[PDB]
Amino acid sequence: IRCFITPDITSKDCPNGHVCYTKTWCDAFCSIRGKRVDLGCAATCPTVKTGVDIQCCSTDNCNPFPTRKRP
Amino acid sequence: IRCFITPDITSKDCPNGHVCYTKTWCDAFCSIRGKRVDLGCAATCPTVKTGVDIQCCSTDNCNPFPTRKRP
Amino acid sequence: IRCFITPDISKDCPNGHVCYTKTWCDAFCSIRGKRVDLGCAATCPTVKTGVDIQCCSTDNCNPFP
């Protein structure tokens, strides 16, 4: 599967069976920078929590940077 | 004054006395794409409204893309 | 003189060169931080409004900030 993998913005090749994901979360710099937005691939989907917004999908290049698709 | 001017991400030269600005607003595609985020320079600052978030500043390159600097 | 040269981040440059650190904002400055360029040149490079350059003359004097 092809997935986006930060810090780069180009598509990368991941092993068959992985999922592409985005993960928006607070790292050590949240009070200064706001939430980090990571794009990656993994064998399992990361976990949805009160402070973590997550997308997971199983088709090529399905994890570009998230956007709010509405006003 | 130097300001960022979309669609490019590099600093541009604007006449002395202009302000750099950011403007986040709903254009024709808001229901599909979300709010547009423009960076520009103008002689006066654009207007703050219920649907328009605006930054204005008067130093070089002071209008990069906005971020939420907190969780 | 030994300088860092991005994106390698250490190279041997001819004696008389200086190392440098260029930093500046592009439109991603709040998203990724400032742009950073490390290199070496026979003389301290000239840049423009908004760009900070620090030139130094000792080995490894331009590490990643």
Binding site: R33, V37 | - | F28, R32, K34
Partner: peptide
Amino acid sequence: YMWDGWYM
């Protein structure tokens, strides 16, 4: 870039 990640 200074940071090793993308921040919103």
